[PDB]
Design an enzyme around this catalytic site. Sequence first.
Site, PDB file in Angstrom:
ATOM      1  CG  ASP A  15      -0.448  -0.145   2.496  1.00 40.60           C
ATOM      2  OD1 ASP A  15       0.784   0.127   2.664  1.00 40.60           O
ATOM      3  OD2 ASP A  15      -1.234  -0.452   3.425  1.00 40.60           O
ATOM      4  NE  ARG A  29      -1.111   3.120   4.162  1.00 38.49           N
ATOM      5  CZ  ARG A  29      -2.306   2.540   4.015  1.00 38.49           C
ATOM      6  NH1 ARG A  29      -2.983   2.577   2.855  1.00 38.49           N
ATOM      7  NH2 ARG A  29      -2.834   1.886   5.037  1.00 38.49           N
ATOM      8  CG  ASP A  34      -4.244  -1.914   6.659  1.00 39.19           C
ATOM      9  OD1 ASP A  34      -3.170  -1.265   6.505  1.00 39.19           O
ATOM     10  OD2 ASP A  34      -4.571  -2.567   7.655  1.00 39.19           O
ATOM     11  CB  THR A  35      -1.367  -4.200   1.782  1.00 35.99           C
ATOM     12  OG1 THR A  35      -0.458  -3.105   2.019  1.00 35.99           O
ATOM     13  CG2 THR A  35      -2.148  -3.942   0.453  1.00 35.99           C
ATOM     14  CD  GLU A  37       3.013  -2.759   7.687  1.00 36.62           C
ATOM     15  OE1 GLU A  37       4.032  -2.560   7.004  1.00 36.62           O
ATOM     16  OE2 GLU A  37       2.085  -1.904   7.829  1.00 36.62           O
ATOM     17  NE  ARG A  75       2.268   6.947   4.980  1.00 38.00           N
ATOM     18  CZ  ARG A  75       1.748   5.866   5.521  1.00 38.00           C
ATOM     19  NH1 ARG A  75       2.283   4.673   5.311  1.00 38.00           N
ATOM     20  NH2 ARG A  75       0.649   5.947   6.190  1.00 38.00           N
TER      21      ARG A  75
HETATM   22  C1  LIG Z   1      -4.456   5.428   4.535  1.00 45.85           C
HETATM   23  C2  LIG Z   1      -4.222   6.552   5.513  1.00 45.85           C
HETATM   24  C3  LIG Z   1      -3.391   6.379   6.606  1.00 45.85           C
HETATM   25  N1  LIG Z   1      -3.200   7.378   7.513  1.00 45.85           N
HETATM   26  C4  LIG Z   1      -2.334   7.200   8.696  1.00 45.85           C
HETATM   27  C5  LIG Z   1      -3.213   6.627   9.813  1.00 45.85           C
HETATM   28  C6  LIG Z   1      -2.278   5.646  10.496  1.00 45.85           C
HETATM   29  O1  LIG Z   1      -1.614   6.238  11.642  1.00 45.85           O
HETATM   30  P1  LIG Z   1      -0.661   5.326  12.625  1.00 45.85           P
HETATM   31  O2  LIG Z   1       0.695   5.272  11.952  1.00 45.85           O
HETATM   32  O3  LIG Z   1      -0.753   6.335  13.744  1.00 45.85           O
HETATM   33  O4  LIG Z   1      -1.258   3.992  12.861  1.00 45.85           O
HETATM   34  C7  LIG Z   1      -1.256   5.279   9.437  1.00 45.85           C
HETATM   35  C8  LIG Z   1      -1.526   3.921   8.815  1.00 45.85           C
HETATM   36  O5  LIG Z   1      -0.704   3.674   7.701  1.00 45.85           O
HETATM   37  P2  LIG Z   1      -0.028   2.240   7.449  1.00 45.85           P
HETATM   38  O6  LIG Z   1      -1.193   1.299   7.329  1.00 45.85           O
HETATM   39  O7  LIG Z   1       0.759   2.456   6.145  1.00 45.85           O
HETATM   40  O8  LIG Z   1       0.767   2.007   8.667  1.00 45.85           O
HETATM   41  O9  LIG Z   1      -1.359   6.216   8.431  1.00 45.85           O
HETATM   42  C9  LIG Z   1      -3.863   8.607   7.328  1.00 45.85           C
HETATM   43  O10 LIG Z   1      -3.674   9.476   8.199  1.00 45.85           O
HETATM   44  N2  LIG Z   1      -4.686   8.829   6.287  1.00 45.85           N
HETATM   45  C10 LIG Z   1      -4.947   7.842   5.376  1.00 45.85           C
HETATM   46  O11 LIG Z   1      -5.753   8.063   4.431  1.00 45.85           O
HETATM   47 CA   LIG Z   2      -0.300  -1.494   5.940  1.00 42.86          CA
END
Ligand SMILES: Cc1cn([C@H]2C[C@H](OP(=O)(O)O)[C@@H](COP(=O)(O)O)O2)c(=O)[nH]c1=O
Ligand SMILES: [Ca+2]
Length: 129
Positions: A15, A29, A34-35, A37, A75
């Site tokens: 992702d 991103r 959600d993929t 890890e 991102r």
């Molecule tokens: C997909 C996405 C993730 N995020 C943030 C929320 C999550 O915070 P936390 O890092 O605090 O968990 C994190 C999840 O991404 P990942 O799934 O790549 O880790 O990215 C956003 O803020 N907006 C979005 O649209």
């Molecule tokens: Ca992920």
Amino acid sequence: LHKEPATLIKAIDGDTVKLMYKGQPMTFRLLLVDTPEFNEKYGPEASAFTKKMVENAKKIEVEFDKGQRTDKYGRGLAYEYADGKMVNEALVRQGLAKVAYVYKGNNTHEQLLRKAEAQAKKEKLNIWS
Ligand SMILES: Cc1cn([C@H]2C[C@H](OP(=O)(O)O)[C@@H](COP(=O)(O)O)O2)c(=O)[nH]c1=O
Ligand SMILES: [Ca+2]
């Protein structure tokens, strides 16, 4: 919403991806998904899927939604297309991503992806097996 150009710099995982957008390198991103890890079950499969889909494409595009364009890590938040086909939807359809992180105002393609997930679940694909 409208598509804009970009070019691949490098695959990262299911992702996230490194793209050049308006001439600047950025980690993207993918919206609404959600993929797992790489360390997790179906992580490597998700990463292989997007690595292939984006490396074999002739034309990568990004489409921002109506909300935040970048997250708290810097991102880019977008829908990514590889020769007109949405990677975010393709992941979901194949059971390699869950619909996730649906925030209000950046959720234009929510129902599209939920319909894909419903079909992935029916077919018991990958994450849903
Ligand atoms: C997909 C996405 C993730 N995020 C943030 C929320 C999550 O915070 P936390 O890092 O605090 O968990 C994190 C999840 O991404 P990942 O799934 O790549 O880790 O990215 C956003 O803020 N907006 C979005 O649209
Ligand atoms: Ca992920």
